[PDB]
Amino acid sequence: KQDFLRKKLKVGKPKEKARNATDTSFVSKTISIRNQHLDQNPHDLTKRLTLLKHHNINVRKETLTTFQKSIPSIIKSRLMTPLLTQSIPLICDESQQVRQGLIDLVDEIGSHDAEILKLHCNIFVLYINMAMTHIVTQIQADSTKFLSHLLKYCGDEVVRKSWVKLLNGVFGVLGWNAKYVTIHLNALYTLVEYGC
């Protein structure tokens, strides 16, 4: 318990700094804030793109409605294929409201630009035949609406690629109740038509 002391001479190690040498070395980190996006920018829909994954349901519905309204000014741009990539998996969504909003969006984008549907037809049919085999019946029922609205616009390359997956998925979901059966039967009519 001394007021002054040495460790030791400590042969082999670096010598030491004596007792009073001042050390003028430091480091200064710089704080980083979020941006918070308070000022309108042209790149604003690119931020609403990812709200299709929002845990809330009204958020996703209103986002799909906004993208529906903003179609003609973005139909030819760098945002449409990511829009469809991020919105197609809502076929297996838990809400009739969101599925209906997506039906409306695909109708609008089909009336405007159908080459994008022709380009994205594969993941479309994959998610449709996933919904056809979904253990949830709310999702298993609303498959054929997406299918019919798809055939309405692209129609024949979908069957030129995948015919049997479609047919066996429909015959599965049919079980082979009031209006879902009618929708399945209309889809069957349109499918067999595009098979002619």
Binding site: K1, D3, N20, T22
Partner: protein
Amino acid sequence: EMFKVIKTGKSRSKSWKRMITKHTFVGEGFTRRPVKMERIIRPSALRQKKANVTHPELGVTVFLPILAVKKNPQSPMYTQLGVLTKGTIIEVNVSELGMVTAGGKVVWGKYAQVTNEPDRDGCVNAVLLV
């Protein structure tokens, strides 16, 4: 005579808390501890930053900022608490005096010994150790 007992609770039955009655030096980045975790209380009024240091030569005194407490002769716990009792030895800045060693290195810290009991006087008066 140094620590006062402080009691906590509605029915005050727990004491466990100790207030230092005398003047103190805490440092530059003090930042009080939470109440559930603080035991030693060093109140803001009994907290000194500057002393009144006299050079025995030159017949001159200066109001210098304190840098540290190295040795309070009573129970070196008190050194870590930073208690400025009589006879306490402190490091004070001396850059105002323009002292320089052989080599041209400016001196900015020196030892001083307090000569008063600042629990009785708000002043902390000290003498430089040349």
